[PDB]
Amino acid sequence: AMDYQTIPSQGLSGEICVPGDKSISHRAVLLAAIAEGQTQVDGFLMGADNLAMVSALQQMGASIQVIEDENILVVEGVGMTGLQAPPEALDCGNSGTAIRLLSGLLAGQPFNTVLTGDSSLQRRPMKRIIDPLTLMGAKIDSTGNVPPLKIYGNPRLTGIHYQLPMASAQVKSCLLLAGLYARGKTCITEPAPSRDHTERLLKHFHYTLQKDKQSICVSGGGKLKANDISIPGDISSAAFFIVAATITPGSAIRLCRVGVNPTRLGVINLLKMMGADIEVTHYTEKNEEPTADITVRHARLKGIDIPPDQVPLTIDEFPVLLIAAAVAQGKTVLRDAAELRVKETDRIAAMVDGLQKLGIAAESLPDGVIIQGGTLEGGEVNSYDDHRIAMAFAVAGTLAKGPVRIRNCDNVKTSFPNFVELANEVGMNVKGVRGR
Numbered sequence: 001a002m003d004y005q006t007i008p009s010q011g012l013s014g015e016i017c018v019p020g021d022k023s024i025s026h027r028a029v030l031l032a033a034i035a036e037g038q039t040q041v042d043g044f045l046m047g048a049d050n051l052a053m054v055s056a057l058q059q060m061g062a063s064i065q066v067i068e069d070e071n072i073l074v075v076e077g078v079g080m081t082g083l084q085a086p087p088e089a090l091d092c093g094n095s096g097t098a099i100r101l102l103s104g105l106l107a108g109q110p111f112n113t114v115l116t117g118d119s120s121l122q123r124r125p126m127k128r129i130i131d132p133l134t135l136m137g138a139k140i141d142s143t144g145n146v147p148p149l150k151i152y153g154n155p156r157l158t159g160i161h162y163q164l165p166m167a168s169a170q171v172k173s174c175l176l177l178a179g180l181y182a183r184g185k186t187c188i189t190e191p192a193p194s195r196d197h198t199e200r201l202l203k204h205f206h207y208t209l210q211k212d213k214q215s216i217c218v219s220g221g222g223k224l225k226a227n228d229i230s231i232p233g234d235i236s237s238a239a240f241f242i243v244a245a246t247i248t249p250g251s252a253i254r255l256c257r258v259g260v261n262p263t264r265l266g267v268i269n270l271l272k273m274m275g276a277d278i279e280v281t282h283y284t285e286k287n288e289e290p291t292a293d294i295t296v297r298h299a300r301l302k303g304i305d306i307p308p309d310q311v312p313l314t315i316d317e318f319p320v321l322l323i324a325a326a327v328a329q330g331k332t333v334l335r336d337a338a339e340l341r342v343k344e345t346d347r348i349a350a351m352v353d354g355l356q357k358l359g360i361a362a363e364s365l366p367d368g369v370i371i372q373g374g375t376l377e378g379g380e381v382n383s384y385d386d387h388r389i390a391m392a393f394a395v396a397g398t399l400a401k402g403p404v405r406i407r408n409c410d411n412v413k414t415s416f417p418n419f420v421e422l423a424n425e426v427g428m429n430v431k432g433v434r435g436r
């Protein structure tokens with residue numbers, strides 16, 4: 001039982017390299033596992049969520065050498081049909097991405113699999129993948145449309161045309177993966193574009209994608225071919241520092257080699273709309289993902305009305321963006337973000353609770369929040385076991401008038417194992433301490 005304790009910052013400074021992208025890491029190892037040939041993955045995120053994906057794949061006979069101290073995986077692919085029936089349930093930990101992408105991969109295998117997870121994951125919604133996989137011919141049992149899931153593999157799935165009913169890159173990805181195993185074309189239409197890492201990695205692994213009028217499509221029966229991958233820094237991890245440097249007087253930092261995929265840039269798009277001073281330089285493209293260095297200096301902010309097209313491009317950054325909104329001049333309004341309620345925790349409820357506890361006038365909406373910019377006070381908040389709520393309030397502590405105690409931070413290692421170390425290195429004071 002560990003908590004974080006902060007004291008205000010006198011200014012962030014320095015150059016830091018954040019760890020690898022969680023979303024790209026999940027996809028890289030999964031596709032590499034079923035490719036033909038050897039894939040070396042550099043920059044792999046050695047956090048709990050990504051290592052749960054690795055262990056699950058190893059239980060099914062993927063050949064993965066984990067070099068944790070170097071953030072490298074060496075994967076010897078087993079080909080499309082090379083996986084083997086696992087002996088026990090696959091424990092996905094806290095990871096919705098893992099359970100949802102694995103379900104797509106496993107729906108068309110000739111064996112049965114049970115997928116489970118931690119107490120948070122077992123409360124999260126799965127009807128969104130069960131419905132369309134079932135249309136493809138899958139058989140997935142669940143009690144109450146939440147995990148645990150039992151997948152009765154069907155090696156004769158059929159492609160479908162599906163329009164996403166919510167802006168979910170996970171549903172899109174799940175269906176594209178099942179599409180690799182399905183007879184014919186699987187075409188996905190996205191009315192609200194979400195992160196496109198699956199599409200980019202499929203191309204990297206030489207799997208062809210086609211696009212028509214309104215959708216992206218894959219045809220089953222192709223072969224993934226091994227191709228070394230360098231994973232960019234996670235912009236979601238960098239976002240904590242981007243906000244901290246933006247709001248803390250005297251700050252100027254540079255974040256090196258961060259992924260800057262346009263479908264992941266919402267936090268920068270929105271902060272610039274608020275008045276932030278953010279420069280993206282040294283742009284490079286590798287393995288179909290763009291990377292760049294991001295330089296951030298303190299700037300005074302104004303409240304904004306957040307547009308809906310940016311919600312799927314900023315979904316995981318709302319916790320830390322709301323901290324920026326809390327110290328901006330004026331009102332910030334977030335609507336059409338009901339997806340926040342079905343994450344590791346209900347992130348709207350969690351952010352509103354913590355902000356009120358730190359003296360901010362924050363109000364919940366069914367699909368968002370309304371925040372009146374003000375002044376953060378010291379106090380005590382609860383992470384609700386959500387890594388991003390925890391890190392968001394650690395960022396709040398940079399500008400809070402007094403110390404901030406953040407309860408229950410043991411899940412920060414699901415996405416950012418060295419958060420505390422890097423935070424202290426740049427000037428945002430954080431101590432890991434024993435809780436109650």
Ligand SMILES: O=C(O)C1=C[C@@H](OP(=O)(O)O)[C@@H](O)[C@H](O)C1
Pocket residue numbers: 022023024097167168169170171173195315316339
């Ligand atoms: O596909 C992915 O890697 C992710 C998609 C998002 O979830 P949804 O697909 O539920 O929006 C995001 O919240 C998650 O952390 C990573």
Ligand SMILES: O=C(O)C[NH2+]CP(=O)(O)O
Pocket residue numbers: 094095096097098316343344388415
């Ligand atoms: O990383 C985050 O902020 C949200 N993760 C959602 P999950 O991968 O567990 O579905």
